[PDB]
Design a protein around this ligand. Structure first.
Ligand SMILES: Nc1nc2c(ncn2[C@@H]2O[C@H](COP(=O)(O)OP(=O)(O)OP(=O)(O)O)[C@@H](O)[C@H]2O)c(=O)[nH]1
Ligand SMILES: Nc1nc2c(ncn2[C@@H]2O[C@H](COP(=O)(O)OP(=O)(O)O)[C@@H](O)[C@H]2O)c(=O)[nH]1
Ligand SMILES: [Mg+2]
Lengths: 48, 431, 432
């Protein structure tokens, strides 16, 4: 009774922190992306 | 022989425990080091090879602050260090942290200590659990512990001394949530629970003891007196006694309707000297006054199902029966139609003992009435309404969900409380 | 719950942070060498919340000092309590942020961030039980704002279960060093809504108005504004650093103050209002202290509390006074001003009394309110932002750093949603 209440709990906090880092890691994937773009456009400018 | 294990959970439970054990020591003549210069006190105190008397108790808190005071205090030698258990991180007024997140780390250690105490018992009667409804430890850890105790102890008696929250002394906005969650989870695991409304105690201290701004020290001394009255029958051998089982048999007619109302008298200030000595009639009359109640509610608007009167000190059976007879002539005390025998009376020889330097005056005779009244449902209704106000907006719910709790657990807990209120209503109807 | 790790970022962050440390060191009886010379056991009871105990009788602030510019750090070291700080805890760059959020958040700030995390990890791993973090910074600048929010995100990644607290100073045209402050503030607010558990909204608009109108200081300086900030910071942290029942730790404070995750922006208030020089003063009774809770004149955020409703309130009284009088006065205010408190959060006003008053005052009161009126501060920023953004003015400073227009649109929309959310609960009823 308790096993299938605390396991169902441990799953519902791993999720409420999975959805955290997963959705606050693409928050670094985008900060890499526009950051690559930052000196990329600066380079292809000197290409002209 | 007939041992009782006391468990003190969270700040409220631990602090009330300090007051109770201080009072028990004064009553049995036990010094703060466990030394002492009847024999029934052995139900609550074990004895070591050095002739020292040790409380059959476990003190638990998820934060160390409160218990650290016990292990530095006057009674540091009374308890063995292993029976004072503390974590590092508190439950932060969150039932989910107490029950799940933080509680799950210390639960096994607490049960191992309780097992060691139970192994020293030849006839363990069961447990007395002290906790607040409002704190994260008092609510969350208690329900976790109660569930685990039912597993390990089969059908061993479990009685509660629950601190019902009051806004005058409340520390969290989320106390109604914690109160409902703990009541739902603990209901199927508790045999009998004595609620103590902090507002009722706050008002008695203000009105009867002339304390302008009552502190937990003031509240706990008064609480300790009621706990001592309930437990005196176990710790002493008087003319009329009641064990763990007889309390339940006389006061609990149905499994879920296990919440008796406590009323204590007299509560006299340590000044005056003229305001005494009160007769058996006077103290008995005081039990039927809503001002002396431990929970705020109106019995005149409810129905009684059982009334237990626990007298202490210079009390004679003839005096008691005379007092009960005059009270019976006051038509206003209504009982349910399926209940004939209303009054169970107990007399314990020892007059109430008071803490030196305390607010309470020394009296020759006192009484504690335990009554199972449908009027106690009013306390559940007040709590349920505060829960509903916040829950309709899901205010603060994210704190519990974040700890792994599901919203469904809130609905389940509230539906169970609705069923409890419905049970008190059904019980008061005539056939 | 024990240790709090303090972080100071940017010019404003370091200036306000340094003042916080000199104010609290004086309250805890700690001199500029780290030695305790006080005469009250209450001063040391919870000393470990902000200080590490070093070899012998010495106490060291658990503080990390950060800037992309070196000058501010030198000014801190040269200061009165400058020598108290851990030398290894000063983390500074050489290439500043030039009041550009993009430089602080993506470029220069990103290059320094790891050196800062290395120092925060050292302090965090030393902790018996880390409560979380406390950051002081401005939202109008580049380092405090951009790097500060970058640090919040990086710390949150490594410590997702710890409490994240900030003292965020809002920019104002009244005391402005740059025309781009609405952009920097909006971009930062977007970050704080998502990444902090609690934010004290310290408004320069309100601080300037208090100095000019109330303190009668014709030309306020940052020194004058910072005197109000340090009085507020001392007040709001009283519960964390002295023994008490209410809001004793960062989590308990958040649990009592935050009903909805995003609505974690507090409106601080303080009474009595004093100027640096004013060591007079002879005034302030309990009814007088209590009345200033609804007084817009005493708010550290330029919002009228009577323009909204309080979701939750924490009130801290300091000095030798009657607890009975405080309880009566506090109940009177809630009964008289019923309409300014939400009915669906019962007993939402919590009071604490600390015997130790702040320096110079015998009696003081600090208010922490979670009010729907804070939407006035966010509306002000959104309207200043839109006036500029409509014309794409100064956008080249940000796009030049690799930023896209979408981030600006998103930050603005998120802040407007926050305003809309405050309005929703302002209009909500207990009709059930
Ligand atoms: N009568 C009485 N009530 C108390 C005492 N201490 C706390 N309470 C009440 O209990 C509630 C607060 O819960 P606590 O027991 O302090 O908290 P806790 O169990 O330690 O849980 P956490 O601190 O959240 O981990 C409020 O209703 C208080 O008024 C006490 O010594 N006596
Ligand atoms: N209250 C206060 N505000 C300041 C102080 N210094 C700068 N500011 C404000 O902070 C903003 C400018 O940011 P600043 O901290 O100088 O830039 P940074 O070094 O890149 O973080 C503006 O809103 C200024 O009005 C200070 O000491 N006190
Ligand atoms: Mg506690």
């Amino acid at each position: 009774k308790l096993a299938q209440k605390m396991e169902s709990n441990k799953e519902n906090r791993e999720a409420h922190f999975a959805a955290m880092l997963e959705r606050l890691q693409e928050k670094d994937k985008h900060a890499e992306e526009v950051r690559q773009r930052a000196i990329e456009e600066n380079n292809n400018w000197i290409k002209m | 022989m007939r041992e009782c294990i006391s468990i003190h959970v969270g700040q409220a439970g631990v602090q009330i425990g300090n007051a109770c054990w201080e009072l028990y020591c004064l009553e049995h003549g036990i010094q703060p080091d466990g030394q002492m210069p009847d024999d029934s006190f052995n139900t609550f105190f074990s004895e070591t090879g050095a002739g020292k008397h040790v409380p059959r108790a476990v003190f638990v808190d998820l934060e160390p602050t409160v218990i650290d005071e016990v292990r530095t205090g006057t009674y540091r030698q009374l308890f063995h260090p292993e029976q004072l258990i503390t974590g590092k991180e508190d439950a932060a007024n969150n039932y989910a942290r107490g029950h799940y997140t933080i509680g799950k780390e210390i639960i096994d250690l607490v049960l191992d200590r309780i097992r060691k105490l139970a192994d020293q018992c030849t006839g363990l009667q069961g447990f007395l659990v002290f906790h607040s409804f409002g704190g994260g430890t008092g609510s969350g850890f208690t329900s976790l512990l109660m569930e685990r105790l039912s597993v390990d102890y089969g059908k061993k008696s479990k009685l509660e001394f629950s601190i019902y929250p009051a806004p005058q002394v409340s520390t969290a906005v989320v106390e109604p949530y914690n109160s409902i969650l703990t009541t739902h989870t603990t209901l199927e695991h508790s045999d009998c629970a004595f609620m103590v409304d902090n507002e009722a105690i706050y008002d008695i201290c203000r009105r009867n003891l002339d304390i302008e701004r009552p502190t937990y020290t003031n509240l706990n001394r008064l609480i300790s007196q009621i706990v001592s009255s309930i437990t005196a029958s176990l710790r002493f051998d008087g003319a009329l006694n009641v064990d763990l089982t007889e309390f339940q048999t006389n006061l609990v007619p149905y499994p879920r309707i296990h919440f008796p109302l406590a009323t204590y008298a007299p509560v006299i200030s340590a000044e005056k000297a003229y305001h005494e000595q009160l007769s058996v009639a006077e103290i008995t009359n005081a039990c039927f006054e809503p001002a002396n109640q431990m929970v705020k509610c109106d019995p005149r608007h409810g129905k009684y199902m059982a009334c237990c009167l626990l007298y202490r000190g210079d009390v004679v059976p003839k005096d008691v029966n005379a007092a009960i007879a005059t009270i019976k002539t006051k038509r206003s005390i209504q009982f349910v139609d399926w209940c004939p025998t209303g009054f169970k009376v107990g007399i314990n020889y020892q007059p109430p003992t008071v803490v030196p330097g305390g607010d309470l005056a020394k009296v020759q005779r006192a009484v504690c009435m335990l009554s199972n009244t449908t009027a106690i449902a009013e306390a559940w209704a007040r709590l349920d309404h505060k829960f509903d106000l916040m829950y309709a907006k899901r205010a603060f719910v994210h704190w519990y969900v974040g700890e792994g709790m599901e919203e469904g657990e809130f609905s389940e807990a509230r539906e169970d409380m609705a069923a409890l209120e419905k049970d008190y209503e059904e019980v008061g109807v005539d056939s | 719950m024990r240790e709090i790790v303090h972080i100071q970022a940017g010019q404003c962050g370091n200036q306000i942070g340094a003042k916080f440390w000199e104010v609290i060191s004086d309250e805890h009886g700690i001199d500029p060498t780290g030695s305790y010379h006080g005469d009250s056991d209450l001063q040391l009871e919870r000393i470990n919340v902000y200080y590490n105990e070093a070899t012998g009788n010495k106490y060291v602030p658990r503080a990390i000092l950060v800037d992309l510019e070196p000058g501010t750090m030198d000014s801190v070291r040269s200061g009165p309590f400058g020598q108290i700080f851990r030398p290894d805890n000063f983390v500074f760059g050489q290439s500043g942020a030039g009041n550009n959020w993009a430089k602080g958040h993506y470029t220069e700030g990103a290059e320094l961030v790891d050196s800062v995390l290395d120092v925060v990890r050292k302090e965090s791993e030393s902790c018996d039980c880390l409560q979380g973090f406390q950051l002081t910074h401005s939202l109008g600048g580049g380092t405090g704002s951009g790097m500060g929010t970058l640090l919040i995100s990086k710390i949150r990644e490594e410590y997702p279960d710890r409490i994240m607290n900030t003292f965020s100073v809002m920019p104002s045209p009244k005391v402005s060093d740059t025309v781009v402050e609405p952009y920097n503030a909006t971009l930062s607010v977007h970050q704080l809504v998502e990444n902090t558990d609690e934010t004290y909204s310290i408004d320069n608009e309100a601080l300037y108005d208090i100095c000019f109108r109330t303190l009668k200081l014709t030309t306020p300086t940052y020194g004058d504004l910072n005197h109000l900030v340090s009085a507020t910071m001392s007040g709001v942290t009283t519960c964390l650093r002295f023994p008490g029942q209410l809001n004793a730790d960062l989590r308990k404070l958040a649990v009592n103050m935050v009903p909805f995750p995003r609505l974690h922006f507090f409106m601080p208030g303080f009474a009595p209002l004093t100027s640096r020089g004013s060591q007079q003063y002879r005034a302030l009774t309990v009814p007088e202290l209590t009345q200033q809770m609804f007084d817009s004149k005493n708010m550290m955020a330029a919002c009228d509390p009577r323009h909204g409703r309080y979701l939750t309130v924490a009130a801290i009284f300091r000095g030798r006074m009657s607890m009975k009088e405080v309880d009566e006065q506090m109940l009177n205010v809630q009964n008289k001003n019923s309409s300014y408190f939400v009915e669906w959060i019962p007993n939402n006003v919590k009071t604490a009394v600390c015997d130790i008053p702040p320096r110079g005052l015998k009696m003081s009161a600090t208010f922490i309110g979670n009010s729907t009126a804070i939407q006035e501060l966010f509306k002000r920023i959104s309207e200043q932002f839109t006036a500029m953004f409509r014309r794409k003015a100064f956008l080249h400073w940000y796009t030049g750093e690799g930023m896209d227009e979408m981030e600006f649109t998103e930050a603005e929309s998120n802040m407007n949603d926050l305003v809309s959310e405050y309005q929703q609960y302002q209009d909500a009823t207990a009709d059930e």
